[PDB]
Amino acid sequence: MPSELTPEERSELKNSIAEFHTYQLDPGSCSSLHAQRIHAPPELVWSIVRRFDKPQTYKHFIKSCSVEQNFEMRVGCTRDVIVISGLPANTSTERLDILDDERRVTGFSIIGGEHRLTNYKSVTTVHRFEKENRIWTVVLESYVVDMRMFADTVVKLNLQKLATVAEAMARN
């Protein structure tokens, strides 16, 4: 399935999973890692997911997102998200933690808002794969949060939306 790494992909990603997606958890925390294969070039995928100011273009569940205007997003910037009705959250204030255009790493922390999550922090990495003439992408996204099944579903569906957007753009 597009969310289940092949053994070859898992072997190639061993160092990245260790570097960014493995947690030494206190007894009051939990973590989760999700993967998504995308049949599009990794720089295209990265160009979408790196836009911290426009999460609604690659995520579900967002009614609106406010950032300061006329300013290029950089580490430390925040965004104010209104979550669509019907979820265990109404707003989220989120800080951009990582924006590495060379390595294709981004991540954010939820620092405020009306919701149930304490100390949520996530990291997303975008990886290039190639075999014969064919180049594809794997996206890894993990989070840690204080004490899961709902957040897992949000991440999985968001990664699938990112796949749908990138593959739509890649059609020739």
Site of interaction with a copy of itself (CB under 8 A): 60, 86-88, 149-150, 152-153, 156-157, 164
Q: Which does 149 bind (CB under 5 to 8 A by kind): ligand PYV, a copy of itself, none?
A: a copy of itself
Handedness of CA 46, 48, 51, 57 (dihedral sign): negative
Tell me the closest approach of the beta carbon of residue 152 to ligand PYV, in angstroms: 8
Contact predicate 163/56, CB 8 Å: no
CA distance 140 to 90: 26
Site for ligand PYV in 113-132 (CB under 6 A): 115, 117, 120
Contact predicate 43/169, CB 8 Å: no
Is 155 one of the binding residues for ligand PYV (CB under 6 A)? yes
| Those residues with Cβ within 8 angstroms of residue 86's Cβ, 6 or more apart along the chain or in another chain | none
- The nearer residue to a copy of itself, 146 or 152, going by C-beta atoms, is 152
Q: Is 134 annotated as a binding residue?
A: no
- The nearer residue to a copy of itself, 66 or 153, going by C-beta atoms, is 153
